[PDB]
Amino acid sequence: ESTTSEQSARMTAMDNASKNASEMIDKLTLTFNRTRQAVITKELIEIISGAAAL
């Protein structure tokens, strides 16, 4: 009985952990996209300012 209960609870806990990890993954993916766009914009602005100040 204990091993059956333990396996069932292990499956449920791993499923919950996977769901939480996926939620964190999508949130961090949105953050990563924002950061990537910000980095590209910042570097291009630096290049443009350097060219214009010449």
Partner: peptide
Amino acid sequence: RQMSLLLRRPPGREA
């Protein structure tokens, strides 16, 4: 990219 920048051609993403 080096040739274009040295020719003062306008740059873009990643120069």
